[PDB]
Amino acid sequence: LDNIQSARPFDELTVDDLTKIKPEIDAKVEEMVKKGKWDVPGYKDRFGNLNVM
């Protein structure tokens, strides 16, 4: 139960904190920009895009 032992500030977790704990996020975003894919695969299905139309 080490997962619950470290407590959970997901309402206030910083994206800089994720970049610090995961450079994989920074590398994936950087290569995803370099190739040009502004789409995020599998985002739209569980999270509503909230485009006007």
Partner: protein, 59 residues
Amino acid sequence: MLKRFPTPILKVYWPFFVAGAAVYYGMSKAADLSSNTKEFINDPRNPRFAKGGKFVEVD
């Protein structure tokens, strides 16, 4: 603050910039041709008066 990401903005958008320079030059010559007309040769805020010449004023 903000982490700058090196996005390719030159090997994609070069004809836009070349067109920008061309329209810049063509509008420069258009402005110089329009700034010497009969209506606007005596408007004192044109940049002719700041260098040398003064008041053709024959119309």
